Each structure stands twice: as C-alpha cells, then as structure tokens.
Amino acid sequence: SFDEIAPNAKKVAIYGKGGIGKSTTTQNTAAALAYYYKLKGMIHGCDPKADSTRMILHGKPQETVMDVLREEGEEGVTLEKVRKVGFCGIYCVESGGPEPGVGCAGRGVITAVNLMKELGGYPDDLDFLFFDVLGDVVCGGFAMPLRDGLAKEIYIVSSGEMMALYAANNIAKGILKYAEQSGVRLGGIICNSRNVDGERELMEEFCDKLGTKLIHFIPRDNIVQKAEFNKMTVVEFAPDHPQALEYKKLGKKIMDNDELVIPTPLSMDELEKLVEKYGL
Amino acid sequence: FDEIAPNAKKVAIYGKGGIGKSTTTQNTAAALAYYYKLKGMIHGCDPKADSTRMILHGKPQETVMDVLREEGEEGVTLEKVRKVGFCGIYCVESGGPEPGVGCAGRGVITAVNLMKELGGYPDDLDFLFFDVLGDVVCGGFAMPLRDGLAKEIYIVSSGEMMALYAANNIAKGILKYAEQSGVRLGGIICNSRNVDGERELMEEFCDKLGTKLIHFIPRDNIVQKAEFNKMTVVEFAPDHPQALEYKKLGKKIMDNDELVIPTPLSMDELEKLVEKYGLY
Ligand SMILES: Nc1ncnc2c1ncn2[C@@H]1O[C@H](COP(=O)(O)OP(=O)(O)O)[C@@H](O)[C@H]1O
Ligand SMILES: Nc1ncnc2c1ncn2[C@@H]1O[C@H](COP(=O)(O)OP(=O)(O)O)[C@@H](O)[C@H]1O
Ligand code: SF4
Ligand SMILES: [Mg+2]
Numbered sequence: 062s063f064d065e066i067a068p069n070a071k072k073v074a075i076y077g078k079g080g081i082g083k084s085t086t087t088q089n090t091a092a093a094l095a096y097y098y099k100l101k102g103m104i105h106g107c108d109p110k111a112d113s114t115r116m117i118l119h120g121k122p123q124e125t126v127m128d129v130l131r132e133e134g135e136e137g138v139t140l141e142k143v144r145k146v147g148f149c150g151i152y153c154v155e156s157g158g159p160e161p162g163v164g165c166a167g168r169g170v171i172t173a174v175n176l177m178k179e180l181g182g183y184p185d186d187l188d189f190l191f192f193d194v195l196g197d198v199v200c201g202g203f204a205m206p207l208r209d210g211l212a213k214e215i216y217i218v219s220s221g222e223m224m225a226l227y228a229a230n231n232i233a234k235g236i237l238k239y240a241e242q243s244g245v246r247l248g249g250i251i252c253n254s255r256n257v258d259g260e261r262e263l264m265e266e267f268c269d270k271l272g273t274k275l276i277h278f279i280p281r282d283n284i285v286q287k288a289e290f291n292k293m294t295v296v297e298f299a300p301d302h303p304q305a306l307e308y309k310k311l312g313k314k315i316m317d318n319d320e321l322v323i324p325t326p327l328s329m330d331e332l333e334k335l336v337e338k339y340g341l
Numbered sequence: 342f343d344e345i346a347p348n349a350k351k352v353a354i355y356g357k358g359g360i361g362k363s364t365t366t367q368n369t370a371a372a373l374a375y376y377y378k379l380k381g382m383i384h385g386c387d388p389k390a391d392s393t394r395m396i397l398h399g400k401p402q403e404t405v406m407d408v409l410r411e412e413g414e415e416g417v418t419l420e421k422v423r424k425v426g427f428c429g430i431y432c433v434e435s436g437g438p439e440p441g442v443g444c445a446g447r448g449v450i451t452a453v454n455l456m457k458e459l460g461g462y463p464d465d466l467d468f469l470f471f472d473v474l475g476d477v478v479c480g481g482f483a484m485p486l487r488d489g490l491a492k493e494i495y496i497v498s499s500g501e502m503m504a505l506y507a508a509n510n511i512a513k514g515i516l517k518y519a520e521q522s523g524v525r526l527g528g529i530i531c532n533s534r535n536v537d538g539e540r541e542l543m544e545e546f547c548d549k550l551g552t553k554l555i556h557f558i559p560r561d562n563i564v565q566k567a568e569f570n571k572m573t574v575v576e577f578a579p580d581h582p583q584a585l586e587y588k589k590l591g592k593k594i595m596d597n598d599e600l601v602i603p604t605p606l607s608m609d610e611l612e613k614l615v616e617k618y619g620l621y
C-alpha cells in the first residue's frame with residue numbers, strides 16, 4: 062500500500078500552475094532540510110517537464126523512468142539508472158511521460174511510483190519525500206497522489222495572478238473530493254512572489270476564503286538565476302543568503318505543520334471579485 | 342470532421358495557461374465579424390470556461406457538461422449550449438468534469454460530438470475558432486489535431502521559457518499527427534509582456550521551429566479597461582491601435598497559406614536560445 066512506503070517520512074506533494082516555481086521551491090526546500098537539518102530526503106518529479114531534480118543533481122539532466130523503460134525494457138531496469146543521488150544525499154527520480162499527443166501525460170507518474178515500490182526505491186529511513194506534481198490539470202497520474210493518498214499533505218505554490226489562484230482553487234477542489242476517502246489534506250498555500258504591490262494581502266484573503274493559511278511568502282530574488290547558472294541550488298550556492306534562509310524557514314514550517322485542513326473552494330465569482338478588489 | 346462548416350476556416354488556438362489565448366481568440370473573432378462582417382463561431386475547449394465571456398458581454402455561459410449533467414441528453418437544446426454575442430458570433434463552452442474526476446479533456450469530445458449531432462456548426466460559417474488548453478497535449482485537448490478538427494493551428498506564446506516549452510510540446514503533437522490528419526502549424530502569435538528583445542527571441546524560435554512569427558500583439562492596458570466594461574477591445578474602441586492589431590492578425594490568419602509541419606527544438610536548443618537573449 063502507499064502508506065507502507067517510507068513510513069517514517071513526511072510525505073508531501075507540491076502542486077501549482079506551470080512555471081509558478083514548484084521545482085525551484087521543492088528543490089531548495091529539500092536542499093535546506095538535508096543541509097541545515099541533516100535530514101534524509103528524496104524528490105519524485107511528477108511533472109512531464111522532467112527538470113524537477115536538475116539543481117539537486119547539479120545541472121545534470123536525469124533519465125526519466127519512461128525513457129529507461131522505453132530503451133532498457135522492464136528486464137534491463139535498475140534502481141541505479143532511475144534513482145540518482147545529488148546534493149546532501151537527496152535521492153532523485155523523474156517519472157517522465159509519453160510524447161505530446163500520445164496517450165495520457167499523467168501515465169508516467171503511475172508507472173514510476175509502482176516501479177519505485179517494486180524496486181524498493183523509497184528508503185524506509187527517509188525523513189521527507191516530496192512530489193513535484195503538474196497542477197494545470199487535476200486528472201490521471203497528476204490527481205493520483207490526492208486520490209490514492211500517496212502524499213497526505215499537499216501544498217500549492219501560487220502567485221497573485223488569476224490563473225495561478227484558479228489552478229490552486231481547482232487543486233483544492235480535488236483535495237476536497239477525496240479528503241474523506243484517502244485522508245489527504247491541504248497544509249497551506251506557498252506564495253512565490255512576483256514583486257507586485259499588495260501580493261501578500263491578496264494571498265492572505267484567498268487563504269482565508271479557502272479555509273487554509275499562507276504558510277510562507279517566498280520573495281523574488283535573482284540569486285535563484287545566479288545559482289542556476291553555476292548549476293546548483295540556492296542553498297548549495299550561498300547557504301548564508303537571505304533567500305536560502307527563507308527556504309530553511311519554509312522547510313521547518315512544513316516539517317512541524319499540524320494545521321492540515323480540508324479546503325473550502327471559492328466559486329468562480331468569488332475568485333474574480335477578490336482579484337478585482339486588489340487589482341494587481 | 343471535414344463535413345462540419347466546410348466553407349469555414351477551421352482554426353485552433355493553443356498555448357500555456359494565462360498566456361492570452363482567450364483574449365487573442367475573442368478579439369480576433371470580434372475583429373473579423375466587425376470590420377470584415379464575417380460569420381464566425383468560438384468553441385471553448387479550455388476547462389476554465391471563460392473563452393466566450395467578452396463576446397457574450399460579461400455574461401457567463403453554461404457549459405455543455407453543466408447542461409448535460411443537470412438536464413440529461415434529452416433535455417439538451419442548441420438554445421441552451423450555443424449563445425449569440427458580439428456581431429452574431431456564436432459561442433459554445435465545452436467545460437469539463439470536476440477536478441480530480443476522470444479526464445479533463447473529456448468535455449471537448451462530448452461537446453464537439455453534441456454540436457455535430459444537433460447541427461450547431463452553421464454550414465455558412467466563414468471562420469471557426471477553438472480555444473484549447475495547451476499545458477498538456479492529451480485526451481480531448483489533443484483531439485482537434487488528432488481528428489483533424491481544425492487543420493490550421495496557431496500557438497500564443499511569450500518570451501518566457503515555460504510559454505516556449507509549451508509551444509514546442511504542442512508542435513511535437515502537430516508533427517506526430519501531421520500525416521494522419523493533415524493538421525499543420527500556421528505560425529506563432531506573440532502576446533507581448535513588454536520585455537527587451539522579446540520579438541528577436543520569438544523570431545529565432547520560429548526559425549528553429551520551421552515556422553513564422555505571424556504577429557506581435559503588444560501589451561496594452563486597453564484590454565483590462567475593455568474587460569472592466571464587460572466588452573472586447575474591438576467592441577469597446579474599434580479605432581484604438583490595439584483593436585487594429587487584432588484586425589491585422591485576423592486578416593493574416595484568413596489569408597494564410599504558409600502552413601508547415603514543425604521541427605521541434607531539443608531541450609538543449611531551447612535552453613541555449615533562452616540564455617542567448619536572457620530576457621528574464
Ligand atoms: N523565488 C524565486 N525567485 C526568483 N526566481 C524564481 C523563484 N522561484 C522560481 N523562480 C524562477 O521561475 C522560473 C520557473 O520556476 P519553476 O520552479 O521551474 O516553476 P515550475 O516547476 O512550476 O514550472 C525559473 O526560471 C526560476 O528561476
Ligand atoms: N495583448 C494583451 N495586452 C494586455 N493584456 C493582455 C493581452 N492579452 C491577454 N492579456 C491579459 O492576460 C490575462 C490572461 O489572458 P487569457 O486570454 O485569459 O489567457 P488564457 O486564455 O491563455 O488563459 C488576462 O488578464 C488578460 O487581460
Ligand atoms: S486524464 Fe488528464 S493527463 Fe490523461 S489524457 Fe485526460 S486530460 Fe490528459
Ligand atoms: Mg517544473
């Protein structure tokens with residue numbers, strides 16, 4: 062069952078709109094937890110972009126599970142080819158997916174999670190396990206962590222943008238749908254700032270209406286791009302930089318989080334009027 | 342699907358979420374129906390269900406899935422699913438299932454089949470646009486290419502890496518289904534974000550992709566001002582430079598003959614291209 066895999070670990074899944082900063086937040090948060098707090102972790106990329114583990118692997122792209130299955134076949138698959146070790150011993154896995162227009166994009170997630178369970182790719186002694194999931198659509202393999210209770214705690218990365226909040230509200234609808242069946246809950250909304258006026262204020266009212274909390278406000282900092290150029294995470298590049306400490310704060314907040322709640326999704330009218338009220 | 346609206350230019354607009362597909366599709370259709378007096382129709386294939394709002398003057402449209410769910414296949418009528426808006430532009434919203442329930446693109450198949458059965462695609466149509474979600478190329482979202490529903494595809498994109506990544510993925514889907522359905526890429530439409538050298542990056546991207554940058558839509562506040570008045574930019578101010586830009590684009594789409602099978606870029610090629618200009 063999905064509850065027996067890494068039982069001593071805090072299973073978390075990060076959802077959000079495309080390009081909102083899920084990979085950046087998930088990788089830097091995991092890097093902070095493994096570096097400052099010396100915790101054993103693992104990242105399972107459930108985004109077909111397949112770059113959710115690049116900064117942990119120091120710029121080296123990882124072969125996806127679908128790519129390895131396609132070339133080596135089910136017989137020639139080894140845990141060493143699909144799971145790599147990066148910064149501070151963080152294990153990395155990329156689910157991947159089918160070619161655009163071929164089948165269901167989420168199918169790669171289900172195959173990778175089942176293969177990881179089969180090969181014992183999730184260490185029992187793990188302290189945290191993160192899943193970078195595509196949140197533009199809540200269906201198939203993308204909605205599997207919410208439906209099958211793979212990760213009990215969900216966090217959505219969002220900005221003041223209408224699309225980002227719309228996606229977050231849709232993910233909350235999926236959480237509410239299988240909240241009693243799977244026991245999945247929303248830990249909070251993580252705001253990846255875009256440097257707009259009154260972004261935090263809009264996000265805090267959005268969380269109030271959604272029945273959750275704005276767990277953390279990540280500022281927009283060019284250190285992310287400077288670190289990405291040296292093929293490293295911000296934590297690995299400059300652990301003393303204020304940005305690295307922001308990910309450290311978020312990391313501890315996620316670990317010590319207890320306010321997990323079933324969401325109260327907003328209506329399409331409530332969301333629009335909330336966006337119009339602030340008018341960023 | 343070649344028998345539905347045979348005298349019409351069947352086009353499908355793809356692109357990343359929040360890139361400006363609904364804004365471009367609606368204003369382009371409004372320009373074609375207002376300046377050139379062409380009979381047109383918009384079939385929203387985005388689960389957001391707001392691709393036909395400005396044409397309907399801010400009035401929300403009941404989606405096909407909503408009507409089908411609460412009234413059954415018998416209680417369905419064209420009057421309830423197809424509405425008339427600015428300059429007699431017909432409007433339909435496919436809709437979709439609740440987040441986490443089934444396949445998000447399912448609403449597209451049900452709506453296109455239902456229109457095909459009720460004869461909701463006027464034969465005397467001059468143009469037929471499909472606002473499709475491009476974050477993931479699968480299911481009902483990849484159907485228009487698959488069944489050759491719309492033979493000409495245009496992708497709305499900006500200088501952002503995620504917007505270009507999505508456009509490249511849509512091009513991959515076009516290439517796979519180019520010989521089977523005869524679908525083709527008409528060009529890339531750039532929805533400007535007011536960044537330095539955005540056009541130059543987009544033009545090199547089109548060169549590498551084997552297509553052309555059909556048009557450059559500037560970022561104008563008149564869009565939000567017309568949105569506030571529950572109207573399209575064409576209906577709000579047909580003499581505004583922006584309203585004209587959509588008129589130029591509309592004619593370019595109608596008189597377009599340079600349809601090409603795309604040469605998708607590799608992940609390395611796209612990253613090096615983004616780094617060459619370093620817009621962001
Ligand atoms: N806190 C931040 N400060 C500055 N840039 C950021 C921040 N978070 C994300 N970014 C940038 O945003 C872009 C998208 O980030 P990413 O993590 O890949 O989003 P996603 O995984 O949802 O697609 C990247 O270029 C990244 O450098
Ligand atoms: N040419 C433009 N100039 C200014 N704003 C624009 C333009 N095109 C789109 N927008 C804005 O961008 C946002 C997203 O537009 P939208 O059409 O809904 O994208 P999508 O259909 O891909 O979800 C809207 O708030 C809209 O006002
Ligand atoms: S369930 Fe989702 S990912 Fe799968 S084919 Fe449908 S829209 Fe695509
Ligand atoms: Mg990502």
Ligand SMILES: [Mg+2]
Nearest residue numbers: 363387389392
């Ligand atoms: Mg839309």
